[PDB]
């Protein structure tokens, strides 16, 4: 496909720009800020995060229940950016743990659970707090 060659160019360019504090697009600036913030959360909360993550014991039969239980707990007292970031990090770690354990089928399922949760439970708050543009302001790394 010529589409996939285009996508490879776009991905590479987007990365190079990001390394130098620039952005291919607004969406790329959001993605990049969320990547960094995920990294930072995992650094700052390694112990608690790896602790709760190790007690999951992911199975295909139990993975959805485990996802949904964790996210209802994490957002029980409302939504804020930090929680949003832990939510993303949580999903990443469940994907990694699924692949570690040869349950690669869970990966798309988990992306679907996240997108709908983001969409239905997080998005209104996000948009009432200035949307992802506010997130990049406060959490991104960008040039000026």
């Amino acid at each position: 496909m010529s589409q996939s060659n285009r996508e490879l160019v776009v991905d590479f360019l987007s990365y190079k720009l990001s390394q130098k504090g620039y952005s291919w697009s607004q969406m790329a600036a959001v993605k990049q800020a969320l990547r960094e913030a995920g990294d930072e959360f995992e650094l700052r909360y390694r112990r608690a995060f790896s602790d709760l993550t190790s007690q999951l014991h992911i199975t295909p039969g139990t993975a959805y229940q485990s996802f949904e239980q964790v996210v209802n707990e994490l957002f029980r007292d409302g939504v804020n950016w930090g929680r949003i970031v832990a939510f993303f990090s949580f999903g990443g770690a469940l994907c990694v743990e699924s692949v570690d354990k040869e349950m690669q089928v869970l990966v798309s399922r988990i992306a679907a659970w996240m997108a709908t949760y983001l969409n239905d439970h997080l998005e209104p708050w996000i948009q009432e707090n200035g949307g992802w543009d506010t997130f990049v302001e406060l959490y991104g790394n960008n040039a000026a």
Partner: peptide, 18 residues
Amino acid sequence: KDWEELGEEIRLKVFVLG
């Protein structure tokens, strides 16, 4: 308890341009 407890704590660094 514990994910709610972690949820309540989370601070990351912020670009406080102040």
